Write a protein that binds this ligand. Sequence first.
Ligand code: HEM
Length: 154
Amino acid sequence: MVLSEGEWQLVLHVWAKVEADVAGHGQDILIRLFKSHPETLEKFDRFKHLKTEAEMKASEDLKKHGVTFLTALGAILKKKGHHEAELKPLAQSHATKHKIPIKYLEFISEAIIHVLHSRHPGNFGADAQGAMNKALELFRKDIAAKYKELGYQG
Ligand code: HEM
């Protein structure tokens, strides 16, 4: 796919809001994912033992990885589709080292959309959500293409 400039503007406008509090958004999204899809937590040797949401919120390690992840994602979105270079090292580590199936990338996409809808209802109307979903779909399509090339495809 290819997003229009109008669609990228909707994505980047809400993302600017997200950037006012990177750690907080990173925390909310990861917790959303872990509660919605508990199996995903089993991929993190460092977070695997966290039993409750209270423990997840208190984990400094979890908050740090949330910032690392959001920062990587923000760098990709800001490329407005020209993210080939950024996708390479990311697809290799997640396919070969972490072994994250494509199914899981869909789970986190839903979590991101849920949190943005919760914290920014005014800047995340129907048009803005469709634009963000289009951006994430584009990301997943390219990542899956890289997975194939790397010999994985999960
Ligand atoms: C938009 C999606 C994603 C982005 C931008 C992203 C980004 C990152 C980044 C930057 C790291 C750091 C270095 C590395 O690549 O190993 C990382 C690590 C990791 N990611 Fe992701 N990731 C994404 C989705 C996921 C998903 C869906 C899972 C699991 C359900 C996952 C599991 C992991 C694991 C297991 C590690 C390493 C943790 C550690 O031992 O430090 N990632 N990810």
